[PDB]
Design a protein around this ligand. Structure first.
Ligand SMILES: O=C(c1cccc(O)c1)N1CCOCC1
Ligand SMILES: [Cl-]
Ligand SMILES: [Cl-]
Ligand SMILES: [Cl-]
Length: 163
């Protein structure tokens, strides 16, 4: 465990993280994809061997000794708001199980089901609250990665609010 488990947010490419493992915002088929998924494929392509997994699950594949946790959030283009919310919460619960099993002291994590899988809606708060629900009982240092300057400020405010 971390000595004083924390949440932090950074605005940069998650492929350049300083944590002991990474969460990929994966597709169900283990394809190189777009966005976070493509950056992860370029950095850790070996981790995409047998990485396909259903929506609402996470599957870890090692790149050398570095763990890549492929977490598959729902595409809100295809799911109802209700079913999509259930699967997005479940994906993060599976990430917490994997982080715990691996015994890492730190994890780099993107906000699942934002961007391409958002179905054109702002899901910062919905996705971040499901991240917190899952990760609050873990003792890893969590570092959230984002690309947008306004998102960085809003995520930083939500972290600081509960401290
Ligand atoms: O998921 C979204 C988003 C936000 C609002 C509307 C929309 O159609 C999509 N974004 C990813 C993070 O950077 C901001 C944009
Ligand atoms: Cl960067
Ligand atoms: Cl996404
Ligand atoms: Cl972002």
């Amino acid at each position: 465990g971390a000595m004083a488990p924390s949440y932090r947010v950074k605005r940069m490419d998650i492929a350049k993280n300083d944590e002991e493992c990474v969460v990929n915002a994966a597709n169900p088929r283990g394809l190189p994809g777009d966005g976070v998924c493509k950056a992860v494929y370029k950095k850790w392509p070996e981790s995409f061997k047998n990485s396909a997994t259903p929506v609402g699950t996470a599957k870890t594949v090692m790149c050398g000794t570095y763990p890549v946790i492929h977490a598959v959030g729902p595409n809100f283009s295809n799911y109802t708001e209700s079913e999509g919310d259930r699967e997005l919460a479940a994906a993060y619960r599976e990430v917490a199980k994997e982080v715990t099993r691996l015994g890492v002291n730190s994890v780099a994590i993107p906000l699942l089901s934002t961007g391409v899988y958002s179905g054109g809606k702002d899901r910062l708060t919905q996705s971040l609250n499901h991240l917190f629900t899952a990760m609050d009982s873990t003792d890893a240092d969590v570092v959230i990665y984002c690309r947008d300057k306004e998102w960085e400020k809003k995520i930083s405010e939500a972290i600081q609010m509960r401290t």
